[PDB]
Design a protein around this nucleic acid. Structure first.
Ligand SMILES: [Zn+2]
Lengths: 481, 150, 219, 351, 352
DNA sequence: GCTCGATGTTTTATTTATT
C-alpha cells in the first residue's frame, strides 16, 4: 500500500545514501528530501504520483492554510486522519481493485517489465542500443511509478491500446519547491480552485471500470478518476523473493517480473481539464479549442536551464500555463517561479527523445529569450523555404527542413551554453550575451545553408531559396539591439 | 588600406581618349598588365601592393567595358549589381546563372558582356567591394538579388 | 600539496555522453565522469564484469577537466558538433536468438576540433597510487579512445605529473591555459555548479546517478 | 610493444563512398575546415564482409573452438561458482588440455550453467530444456566456429551472446577516414530519359560527389587479440595484423561504386609499434594545400609531422613504410618498404 | 580471375559532350584541378543505344515511368501471343499499379523493362490463374527460382550490366538486379579552362545586326575512361550463362568503351575521335588507374603522350608495389602490344 | 513460427536581404 509502506526513493537534499521512506515520513517531518532514481523521467513520474495523492488526500481550504502547511509539516495524527479511505484505494496486490490494474486480463503470453520502462523497448534500435535485462525484477515502488508514467507521459503499447486523457505524450509542468515535501504541497490545488477547476463518477478506473466501446463526455469524469486514469487493460503477475531491483539497483522483498495486458478501446469526447499540463488555445470558427502541450517535432531543451526554456516558450509563444502554476502565480505573484518539467518526443509507439528537468537569474532569462529569438528567425526562414518548396510541386524532405533544423539548432547551441553560464555575472553579462548573439547568428546562417544544401542546382527553387534567405536575414537584422 | 573606388571611377572617367582606348581593347583581365596606361591609372590606388593588384584588375576590367556603361548613382545600402542588372530588364536569368557558375577569367569576361548589355545604374563602390572579394557567397548573392528584383 | 596526474584528450572526433535510451547518442561539451572512469578503466585491464576493481577505481580517483581551444596559425578554432547517421544491417531483433532487422537507424553526435586536459588525483581513502595510473596511461592494456572506439588519440594520453594545492594550479602548469575548468573539488573564488547524470551506478550495470561539477571560469 | 598502428594515405577518383539520410557526402570539420568523410563503420564493414577477409580471417585455422579441449580450464574457472556435474552436463549438451580460455566463452557457458542448474532445481529436462534453449544453443555453436572473426572484429550485430563478458569488442579499432585537405564537393545534375516521352526527361536529380586524398587509421590490440583467441601466440596475432594491414590498404566501400567506380589502392602504408596507440591525423590539422595534386603534399606533410613529433610522443619503436611515391622520406628511423608484401613480412617477424 | 578491367585513354578535339542544368560543360575537381567530365550515365546510354550494341548484343531495355503508354506498346507487341487481359494483369502485378484504360498511369519511378521478360511473366500469370493459383502464392513460387527470369534478362543485357531496382510491384522481389560491369565518369588527365564560343544567329529579314547573340562553353580533352566488368555476376544476371558468353559481352564493352562517344553537340563540334590507347587487364579485385592523373598531366608535345606515359609509369609502380600479376594486354597505338584492337578483343575473348 | 490485417495516435508555425 503506497499510503502506508515504504516505497518513496529519496536521499537528503544535499546528502548521500539513498533510503526508502513512506508517505508519513515525508509529510510529517522537517527533513529535506529529494527523489533519487537512475532516471529523470521516473523521478518526474514519482513526483507526479505523489502530487496526485496529495491532491486527493489534503486540499487546503484556503491560501492561508496552503502557505501554512508549506512552512509547517503536519502531525502524524492529522495525516492518518487524512489518508484512511484513500488507504483502502491504494493496493498493488489486491483482491478486486489492484492499483491501476484490471483483474481478469485474457492474454496468451506474459508481457516483460521492459514494456513499462518508456524507451527500453518500442523500437528496433532499442534492442540494438540499450542494456538488456533492465526490467527483469522491479520492486514495488518502481512498478507503481512505471504504471503511472505509462498512464500519463508515455504512449500506448501498440494497436488497441489507449493513451492518457491528455493525449499520448504531453509535457508535465510542476512548481519547484526547496525539497520534496514542499514541492508536493506546492502542486496541490486548494479546495476552492479545485472546485473552480472541476465544475460525475469520482471513482477510479480500477474500481468502477470503463465500459468497452463506450462514449464518455470528459465532463463526466471525477477528478480522482482522471488524476489516476488508466486506459489499457493491465494486471501485474505474482512477485518474487528478496533481491535487487533491476531498475533502481536497490534491495526489495517483493519484485515483479511481468504482467498481463489486453486491448481495450473506448472514447472520451471533449478535453479533461488536467491540472498538470500547459495548453494551446486555438480559436476555430467561433469556438474556443484547447490542446495539451506536447513535444511534437522538436523537444526544446538546453543543458542546466531546460526548465527556463520551456517556461519562456509557454510564457511568450497562445500557450497557457498549467493549473498548478496559475495557482502558484495567484498565491505568490511577486515570488520567483522555476519549473520541474518533463516530456517525450515520439514516433508512434517508439520514443524518439526525452527532455526532463527535475532539480530542487534575470540574465539566464535574457539568454533563453535571445536563443529562442534566433531559433524563431531560423524556423520562419526555413518554413518560407518549405512552403515555397511545396508550392513548386517538388517532393521529398524539402518540406520538413525547418523541423530538423530546429532540433539541430538546440543541439549546437547547447554546445554553446556551458561557457555562457560560466562567465555570467553583473559586469560581464552584456558582453557574454553579445558574443552569444554573434555565435547564434553564425549558427543560424550555417544551419540555413546546411538544411538548404541538398537543393543546390535546382534552378526553379532559386526563387524560393532567395526569398528564404532574405527572410532569415530580415529576422536576424531584427535581433541586434 | 581600402581602394578609393569613386576616385578610380572619376579617374577612369576623365582619362584621355588614347589611354582609355588602349585599356578598352583588352580581351581578358590579365592582358591589362601589358598596357602602361593601366599602370599609370591604378598606381595611385595601391597597385604596387598585390592584394590591391587582383582587386584592381577586376575593377578596371569592368570599367573597361566603357566610359558610359556603368552609371554610378549615390545611395538614397545602394543599388547592388544584381539589382541593377535586373532593373535594366534586358538580361535573361539563365545568363546570370552561367555567370555565377563560371570560373576564373571567364567570369570577368561574361560579367563585362552583361555590363555591356544592361548598362546598369548602381552604387559603384558597392560593386567595387563585391569585386574586391568575389567569393562564392558574392556570386550567390548576385544571383539572388537578380531574382528577388524581378 | 597533493600529487596530480595530468592527461590530454585530443583527437579529430570525440563523444561524451548524455542520458539516453534511444537511437540518438548525444554528446556533452566536455568529458563525462563515467567516460573518464572508462578511459582509465580501459588503460587498466578492467573487464566489464569486474565490479570490484571497477568500484575501487571509482572510489580512488577524482577528476578535473579543462577545455582547450584549438589555435591554428594564430587564429582560434571553435569546437563544432557533428551528427552521424549511423545505420546497422542485421541488428539484433531481440536480446536472444538470431532474428534480426533488415536495417535499423541511429544518430550519434561527436565533437569536432575538441581537445581537453584532465587533472587527476587520489581520494583520502583511495586504493591505488598515481604511479600505477601513470604506468597505465603510459602502457594501456585495452585500446584507449575518446568516448567511442572510432575516436583515436592524436596526442599521448600522458601529459605530465606535478604537485600542487588545487586542480586549477596544477592545470595552470600546462598550456594552453585559460580554458574553463570543471572539477569534482571546489575552488575558493568560484562557486558555479554544473549538474550532470554521469556518476556510473556500477552495482546496477550501465546506470547513472546524479552529480555536480564545480565550475571555475578562465580569464 | 602491445599496439600496432596502421596509417594509410589513399586517393580516390570522383566518387561518393559514404552518405547520410539526405544522400549527402559524409563530412567532418577538422582544423576549422570541411573534410569529406568515410565513416568507421562503413570502412570496417568494407573489410569484414570482403572476400579477402572471409578467406584469410573467416576460414582461419584457429577459427573453430573445440569445447572438448576446453574442459579442464572451464572446470576450474566455473568450478568456483558451479560444480563439475553441471559444468560437464552443460559442456556435453552444448557439444552434443587447453591452457587458457577466451573470456566470452567462459561467460556464455557460465550462463548456460545457470540455466541448467535452474533447470535441475525446478525439476525439468529433456526436449523441454532443449526447446527453451534451442535458439541460444544454435547461436553459441555458430559463434564457436567463428573465433578469429569475433576476436578481430568483435561479435556480430546479431550474435546471441548473453553476458557482460559476451560484449566482445573487436581487437582492431578503425577511426573515421577524413581527407587531408578541405573539400567543396561537386554536384552532378543528371536526367533520366524516358523512352516513351517525347518532350524532356522523366526524372531530374542531383548527386553530390568529390575526389579526395583520404587518411585511414587503425590500430590492433595484440594482447587482447591473443587473449580472445584462447591464449594464442604473438606470431599468430602478427599474421592477423598482416591481414588487417592488407585490407586497410586495399579495401574500399561499395557505396555508389557501380557508377563512380573509385577502385583505387593506397599510395602509402605505414606500420609502427607502440605502447600507446596514436593517430597521425594532426599531420593534417592544418589542411593540406594542393601542389601538383593533393597526394604528394599529403605524404610529405605526413612525413614532416612524424619527423617533428614522433620522438616526443614516445613513438620510438619499430616502424616501416611501404610507398609508391618518391617524395623525400621520413627520418631514417623508419625502414622503407618497396612492396606491400615486404612490409607485411616485416610485420610477421615482430618488426 | 573474376574481374575484367577496361582502361581507355581517348582524345577529343574541341567539343561539348556532356553538359549540366545550365548548358555548361560537366566537370569535376581532381587533384586540386578542374577536369572536364563525361558522366557515366551518358556513356552507358550512349553505348546501349549504339548501332554496335544493336548488331552485337541485342535490344536495349525499355526504360519508362509511363505505364499506360507501356500497356499500349505491350498490347501491340504481345497481342498475338496473349489475350489483352493477361498482359494488363501482368503489368499490374509487376508494377503494383492498377492497369485500366486511363489516359495517364504513372509508375513509382523510371524503370527498365524487358519485353521478353514480360512475355515470360505473363506466361506464368496465364498458367497461374488457369490452375486457380492466386497472386500471393504465385509470388512465392516465382520467388523460388529467379535464374529463369535472369535468362529473360539475357533478352535485356544492359540491365544485366547496369542494374535495376523497383520499389513497388512484384519487381521489388523479383527484378532486383545488381549490375555486373561497373563504370567511372570520364575525367580529363589534365586541367582544363573551358573555352567560350561567342556566336550570332543572323536573321534574313533583319539587315541591321543579328537576331541572336550568345555564348557556348566547349573544350578539347584527353579523357580517361575506366570500367570493370564483374563477370560471375554477369553470369548470374543472365540466368547462369557460361564464362564464354560473359567474356564476349565484355569484349563488346571493350570495343564500345574504346569507340563510342556521346552525340552531344557533335552535329556542330564533331569530335568523332577513337581511343588512341586501350588496355584490358584481368584481376582478382578491381583496380582503377585514375591516380596516374591525380597529379594533372602537364602538356608536352600534346596532352596525349604525357598522359599515356604517366599511365604506364603508374601502372608499373602499382604492379611492382602490390605484386599484381593478372593477365594483361594493352593495345597500344601511340602487358601487350596490340597492333590492332581486334587482337586485343580476341585476346579478351580467350580468357587472356 | 509465422504472415495477415485492422488498429492505438494525430501537424502548424512564411512570404524581400546585402558579409
Ligand atoms: Zn526499484
Amino acid at each position: 500500500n503506497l499510503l502506508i509502506d515504504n516505497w518513496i526513493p529519496v536521499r537528503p537534499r544535499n546528502g548521500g545514501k539513498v533510503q526508502i521512506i513512506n508517505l508519513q515520513s515525508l509529510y510529517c517531518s522537517r527533513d529535506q528530501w529529494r527523489l533519487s532514481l537512475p532516471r529523470d523521467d521516473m523521478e518526474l513520474a514519482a513526483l507526479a504520483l505523489l502530487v496526485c495523492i496529495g491532491q486527493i488526500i489534503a486540499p487546503a481550504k484556503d491560501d492561508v492554510e496552503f502557505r501554512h502547511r508549506i512552512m509547517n509539516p503536519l502531525t502524524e495524527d492529522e495525516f492518518q486522519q487524512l489518508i484512511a479511505p484513500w488507504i483502502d484505494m491504494f493496493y498493488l496486490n489486491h483482491a478486486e481493485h489492484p492499483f491501476m490494474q484490471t483483474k481478469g486480463v485474457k492474454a496468451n503470453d506474459v508481457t516483460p517489465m521492459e514494456k513499462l520502462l518508456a524507451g527500453v523497448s518500442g523500437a528496433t534500435n532499442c534492442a540494438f542500443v540499450n542494456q538488456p535485462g533492465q526490467g527483469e525484477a522491479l520492486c514495488g515502488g518502481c512498478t507503481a511509478i512505471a504504471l503511472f508514467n505509462q498512464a500519463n507521459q508515455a504512449p500506448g503499447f501498440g494497436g488497441g491500446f489507449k493513451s492518457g486523457l491528455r493525449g499520448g505524450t504531453p509535457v508535465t509542468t510542476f512548481v519547484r519547491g526547496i525539497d520534496l515535501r514542499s514541492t508536493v504541497l506546492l502542486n496541490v490545488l486548494t479546495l476552492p480552485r479545485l472546485q473552480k477547476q472541476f465544475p460525475t463518477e469520482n471513482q477510479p478506473t480500477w474500481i468502477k471500470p470503463i465500459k468497452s466501446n463506450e462514449s464518455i463526455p470528459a465532463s463526466s469524469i471525477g477528478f480522482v478518476r482522471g488524476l489516476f486514469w488508466q486506459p489499457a487493460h493491465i494486471e501485474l503477475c505474482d512477485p518474487i523473493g528478496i533481491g535487487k531491483c533491476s531498475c533502481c539497483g536497490q534491495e526489495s522483498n517483493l519484485r515483479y517480473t511481468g504482467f498481463l495486458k489486453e486491448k481495450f478501446t473506448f472514447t472520451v469526447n471533449g478535453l479533461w481539464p488536467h491540472p498538470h499540463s500547459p495548453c494551446l488555445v486555438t480559436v476555430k470558427k467561433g469556438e474556443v479549442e484547447e490542446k495539451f502541450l506536447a513535444f511534437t517535432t522538436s523537444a526544446p531543451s538546453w543543458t542546466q536551464i531546460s526548465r527556463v526554456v520551456v517556461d519562456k516558450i509557454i510564457q511568450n509563444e497562445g500557450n497557457r500555463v498549467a493549473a498548478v502554476v496559475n495557482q502558484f502565480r495567484n498565491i505568490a505573484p511577486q515570488s520567483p517561479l522555476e519549473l520541474i518539467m518533463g516530456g517525450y518526443r515520439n514516433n508512434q509507439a517508439s520514443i524518439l527523445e526525452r527532455r526532463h528537468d527535475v532539480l530542487m537569474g534575470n540574465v539566464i532569462n535574457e539568454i533563453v529569450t535571445v536563443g529562442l529569438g534566433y531559433k524563431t528567425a531560423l524556423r520562419k526562414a526555413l518554413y518560407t523555404f518549405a512552403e515555397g518548396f511545396k508550392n513548386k510541386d517538388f517532393k521529398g524532405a524539402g518540406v520538413s527542413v525547418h523541423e530538423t533544423a530546429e532540433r539541430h539548432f538546440y543541439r549546437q547551441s547547447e554546445l554553446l551554453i556551458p561557457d555562457v553560464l560560466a562567465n555570467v555575472n553583473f559586469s560581464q553579462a552584456d558582453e557574454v550575451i553579445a558574443d552569444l548573439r554573434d555565435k547564434l547568428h553564425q549558427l543560424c546562417e550555417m544551419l540555413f545553408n546546411q538544411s538548404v544544401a541538398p537543393y543546390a542546382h535546382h534552378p526553379k527553387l532559386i526563387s524560393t531559396l532567395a526569398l528564404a534567405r532574405a527572410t532569415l536575414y530580415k529576422h536576424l537584422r531584427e535581433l541586434k539591439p | 588600406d581600402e581602394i578609393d573606388a569613386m576616385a578610380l571611377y572619376r579617374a577612369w572617367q576623365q582619362l584621355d581618349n588614347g589611354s582609355c582606348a588602349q585599356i578598352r581593347r583588352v580581351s581578358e583581365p590579365d592582358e591589362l598588365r601589358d598596357i602602361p596606361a593601366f599602370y599609370r591609372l591604378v598606381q595611385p590606388f595601391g597597385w604596387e601592393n598585390p592584394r590591391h593588384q587582383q582587386a584592381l584588375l577586376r575593377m578596371v576590367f569592368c570599367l573597361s567595358a566603357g566610359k558610359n556603361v556603368i552609371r554610378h548613382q549615390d545611395k538614397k545600402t545602394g543599388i547592388s549589381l544584381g539589382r541593377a542588372l535586373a532593373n535594366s530588364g534586358r538580361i535573361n536569368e539563365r545568363r546570370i546563372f552561367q555567370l555565377i557558375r563560371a570560373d576564373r577569367t571567364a567570369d570577368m569576361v561574361q560579367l563585362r558582356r552583361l555590363l555591356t548589355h544592361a548598362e546598369p545604374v548602381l552604387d559603384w563602390p558597392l560593386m567595387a567591394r563585391m569585386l574586391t572579394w568575389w567569393g562564392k557567397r558574392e556570386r550567390q548573392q548576385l544571383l539572388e538579388d537578380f531574382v528577388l528584383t524581378t | 600539496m597533493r600529487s596530480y596526474l595530468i592527461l590530454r584528450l585530443a583527437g579529430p572526433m570525440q563523444a561524451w555522453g548524455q542520458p539516453t535510451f534511444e537511437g540518438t547518442r548525444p554528446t556533452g561539451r566536455f568529458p563525462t565522469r563515467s567516460g573518464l572512469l572508462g578511459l582509465l578503466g580501459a588503460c587498466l585491464g578492467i573487464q566489464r564484469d569486474d565490479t570490484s576493481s571497477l568500484q575501487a577505481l571509482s572510489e580512488s580517483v577524482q577528476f578535473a577537466v579543462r577545455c582547450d581551444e584549438l589555435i591554428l596559425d594564430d587564429r582560434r578554432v571553435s569546437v563544432t558538433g557533428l551528427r552521424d547517421y549511423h545505420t546497422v544491417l542485421g541488428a539484433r531483433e531481440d536480446y536472444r536468438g538470431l532474428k534480426s532487422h533488415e536495417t535499423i537507424q541511429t544518430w550519434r553526435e561527436y565533437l569536432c576540433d575538441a581537445s581537453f586536459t584532465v587533472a587527476l588525483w587520489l581520494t583520502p581513502h583511495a586504493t591505488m597510487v598515481i604511479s600505477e595510473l601513470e604506468k597505465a596511461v603510459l602502457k594501456p592494456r585495452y585500446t584507449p579512445y575518446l568516448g567511442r572506439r572510432s575516436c583515436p588519440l592524436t596526442h599521448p594520453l600522458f601529459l605530465g605529473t606535478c604537485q600542487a594545492s588545487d586542480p586549477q594550479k596544477a592545470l595552470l602548469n600546462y598550456e594552453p591555459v585559460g580554458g574553463d575548468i570543471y572539477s569534482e573539488e571546489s575552488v575558493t573564488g568560484h562557486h558555479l555548479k554544473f549538474t550532470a547524470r554521469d556518476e556510473p551506478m556500477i552495482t546496477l550495470p550501465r546506470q547513472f546517478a546524479s552529480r555536480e561539477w564545480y565550475v571555475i571560469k578562465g580569464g | 610493444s602491445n599496439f600496432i598502428n596502421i596509417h594509410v594515405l589513399i586517393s580516390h577518383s570522383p566518387s561518393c563512398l559514404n552518405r547520410d539520410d539526405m544522400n549527402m557526402q559524409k563530412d567532418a570539420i577538422f582544423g576549422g575546415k570541411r573534410r569529406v568523410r568515410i565513416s568507421s563503420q562503413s570502412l570496417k564493414r568494407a573489410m569484414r564482409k570482403s572476400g579477402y577477409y572471409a578467406q584469410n580471417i573467416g576460414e582461419s585455422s584457429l577459427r573453430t573452438i573445440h569445447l572438448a579441449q576446453l574442459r579442464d580450464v572451464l572446470r576450474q574457472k566455473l568450478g568456483e561458482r558451479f560444480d563439475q556435474k553441471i559444468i560437464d552436463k552443460t559442456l556435453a549438451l552444448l557439444s552434443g588440455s587447453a591452457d587458457a580460455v577466451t573470456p566470452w566463452v567462459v561467460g556464455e557457458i557460465a550462463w548456460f550453467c545457470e540455466q541448467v542448474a535452474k533447470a535441475e532445481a525446478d525439476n525439468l529436462d529433456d526436449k523441454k530444456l532443449l526447446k527453451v534453449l534451442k535458439e541460444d544453443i544454435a547461436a553459441i555453436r555458430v559463434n564457436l566456429q567463428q573465433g578469429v572473426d569475433i576476436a578481430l572484429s568483435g561479435r556480430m550485430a546479431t550474435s546471441g551472446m548473453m553476458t557482460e563478458l559476451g560484449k566482445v569488442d573487436g581487437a582492431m579499432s578503425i577511426a573515421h577516414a577524413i581527407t587531408t585537405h578541405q573539400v567543396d564537393s561537386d554536384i552532378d545534375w543528371f536526367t533520366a530519359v524516358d523512352d516513351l516521352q517525347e518532350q524532356g526527361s522523366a526524372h531530374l536529380g542531383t548527386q553530390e560527389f568529390s575526389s579526395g586524398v583520404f587518411y585511414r587509421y587503425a590500430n590492433i590490440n595484440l594482447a587482447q587479440l591473443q587473449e580472445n583467441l584462447g591464449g594464442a601466440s604473438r606470431e599468430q596475432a602478427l599474421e592477423i595484423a598482416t591481414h588487417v594491414v592488407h585490407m586497410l590498404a586495399t579495401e574500399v566501400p561499395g557505396a555508389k561504386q557501380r557508377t563512380y567506380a573509385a577502385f583505387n589502392p593506397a599510395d602509402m602504408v605505414m606500420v609502427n609499434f607502440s605502447d600507446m596507440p596514436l593517430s597521425m591525423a594532426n599531420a593534417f590539422e592544418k589542411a593540406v594545400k594542393a601542389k601538383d595534386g593533393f597526394l604528394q603534399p599529403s605524404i610529405q606533410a605526413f612525413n614532416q609531422y612524424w619527423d617533428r613529433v614522433a620522438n616526443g610522443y614516445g613513438l620510438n619503436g619499430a616502424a616501416a613504410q611501404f610507398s609508391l611515391s618518391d617524395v623525400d622520406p621520413i627520418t631514417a628511423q623508419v625502414k622503407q618498404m618497396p612492396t606491400l608484401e615486404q612490409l607485411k613480412s616485416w610485420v610477421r617477424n615482430n618488426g
